[PDB]
């Protein structure tokens, strides 16, 4: 699990996992004047890692204003930082720029400016990211198509080197959909994740207010990624505001990976309030958050909802039906496979309500509702403050009954000897007797 937020007053987060045993984290700071960097051996270490300023805006001319959205990459023996910048003489003439370092440690290393990423059309440009598909390097970025009445569209090009595209850009998405064009017509912040023979390119859309959200384009890893018709745009956001979790305008994301290389991690910013006061560029409250990406059975990513602050939620799968997860539906708890509404199946383990070192399981999509029993049947229901509820929603965490080493089992606090178990797919608390009952009452957290 992670503890959110990772970093206050840090927007447009980018985390790179290097081969040297470190994660590197850069981001947009509210001053918009410089490029910070911090490293840690773990993703959670990043919360306390000290920032170093690797580069500061120029006093005059290009790269002199609006230092926005850096990414750090290690490529062909060297470090590259991609950022966007305006000029002192013109603060909205935002272009894409590249830094290069040959030093082993990018925190202490020395940086050379590779200048502007050239593009045939000279217009508003930012959010350059780079990725390799099938051994071929690409750049994707946000830029104004002057023949469109909007802010930015999405472009992709192959690269000749880390700071230079080859051939011509293809525009692969423009903001047309109702949810893309709130306040401003925007497609920005592209980020690529590849999985199961597919390439997913999430992007940010609408204004950076509560209306900020993620769209997604999908393609085949075998497709020509410069042919616009290779890509399919998702009709609805893949990640948006959750009032229920107090998370507003989630977006400008990137992707990294868990400590074991096994889990994909979504990195992004949001706000914990809806309406900004003052000039939105000047509101510094955007913060950096982490949560695991889960993969759907059809191999698409499932981002769920942006989760409540504090520790991240978990999913529990059945011992005897390892495809099936504890989830709620019409607030009844059950086990089910291939959960489309991902958050119906996330719960965080918290200090038990009833006390004495027990545990409770809070719903991720309905904070302050808990898995609790009533008449021995298990539901998800609002903590009403009563002692009854405290007791129906607390369990003693036991070693799994069919798996003592790695499994987990939930013994009722107010009905000791009754365990959480599935029967006919529905969750109950019932006494456990047969070997099969012991499997019905064993579960795995995060496998
Ligand atoms: Cl579902
Ligand atoms: Na980015």
UniProtKB/Swiss-Prot annotation:
Annotated residues for binding of substrate: 151, 252, 286, 328-331, 344, 422-425, 440
Region (ABD): 314-444
Localization per record: Secreted
EC number: 3.2.1.55
Keywords: Carbohydrate metabolism, Glycosidase, Hydrolase, Secreted, Signal
Reported effect, residue 12 to N: Maintains an extremely weak catalytic activity
Phenotype when changing residue 12 to A: Abolishes catalytic activity
Origin superkingdom: Bacteria
Catalysed transformations (reactions): Hydrolysis of terminal non-reducing alpha-L-arabinofuranoside residues in alpha-L-arabinosides
Active site: 12 (proton acceptor), 188 (proton donor)
Family recorded in the similarity comment: Belongs to the glycosyl hydrolase 43 family.
Domains (record comment): Organized into two domains: an N-terminal catalytic domain and a C-terminal arabinose-binding domain (ABD).
Protein name according to UniProt: Extracellular exo-alpha-(1->5)-L-arabinofuranosidase
Encoding gene, per UniProt annotation: Araf43A
């Amino acid at each position: 699990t992670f503890t959110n937020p990772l970093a206050e007053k840090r927007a447009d987060p980018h985390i790179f996992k290097h081969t040297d045993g470190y994660y590197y984290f850069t981001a947009t700071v509210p001053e918009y004047d410089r490029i910070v960097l911090r490293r840690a051996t773990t993703l959670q270490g990043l919360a306390t890692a000290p920032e170093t300023t690797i580069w500061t805006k120029h006093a005059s001319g290009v790269m002199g204003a609006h230092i926005w959205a850096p990414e750090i990459h290690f490529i062909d023996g060297k470090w590259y930082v991609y950022f966007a910048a305006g000029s002192t003489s013109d603060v909205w003439a935002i272009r894409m720029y590249v830094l290069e370092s040959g030093a082993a440690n990018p925190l202490t290393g020395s940086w050379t400016e590779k200048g502007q990423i050239a593009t045939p059309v000279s217009s508003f440009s930012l959010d350059a990211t780079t990725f390799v598909v099938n051994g071929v390097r690409h750049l994707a970025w946000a830029q104004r198509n002057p023949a469109e009445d909007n802010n930015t569209s999405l472009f992709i090009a192959k690269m000749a080197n880390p700071w230079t595209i080859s051939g011509t850009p293809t525009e692969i998405s423009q903001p047309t959909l109702s949810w893309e064009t709130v306040g401003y017509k925007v497609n920005e912040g592209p980020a690529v994740i590849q999985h199961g023979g597919k390439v997913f390119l999430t992007y940010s859309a609408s204004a950076t207010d509560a209306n900020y959200c993620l769209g997604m384009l999908s393609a085949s890893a075998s497709a020509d990624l410069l042919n616009a018709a290779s890509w399919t745009k998702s009709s609805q956001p893949v990640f948006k505001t959750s009032e229920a979790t107090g998370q507003y305008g989630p977006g400008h994301n990137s992707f990294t990976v868990s400590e074991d290389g096994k889990s994909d991690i979504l990195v992004y910013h949001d706000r914990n309030y809806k309406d900004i006061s003052g000039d939105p560029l000047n509101d510094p409250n955007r913060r950096t958050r982490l949560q695991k990406v889960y993969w759907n059975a059809d191999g698409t990513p499932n981002f769920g909802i942006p989760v409540a602050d504090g520790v991240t939620p978990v999913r529990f799968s059945s011992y005897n039906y390892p495809d099936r997860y504890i989830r709620h539906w019409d607030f009844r708890a059950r086990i089910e496979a291939n959960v489309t509404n991902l958050a119906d199946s996330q719960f965080r383990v918290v200090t038990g309500l009833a006390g004495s070192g027990t545990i409770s399981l809070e719903s991720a999509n309905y904070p302050g509702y808990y898995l609790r029993h009533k008449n021995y049947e298990v539901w998800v229901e609002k903590n009403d403050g009563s002692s009854a509820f405290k007791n129906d929603a607390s369990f003693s965490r036991r070693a799994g009954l069919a798996d003592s080493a790695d499994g987990i089992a939930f013994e009722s606090y107010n009905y000791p000897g009754r365990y959480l178990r599935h029967y006919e797919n529905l969750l109950r608390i019932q006494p456990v007797s047969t070997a099969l009952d012991r499997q019905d009452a064993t579960f795995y957290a995060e496998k």
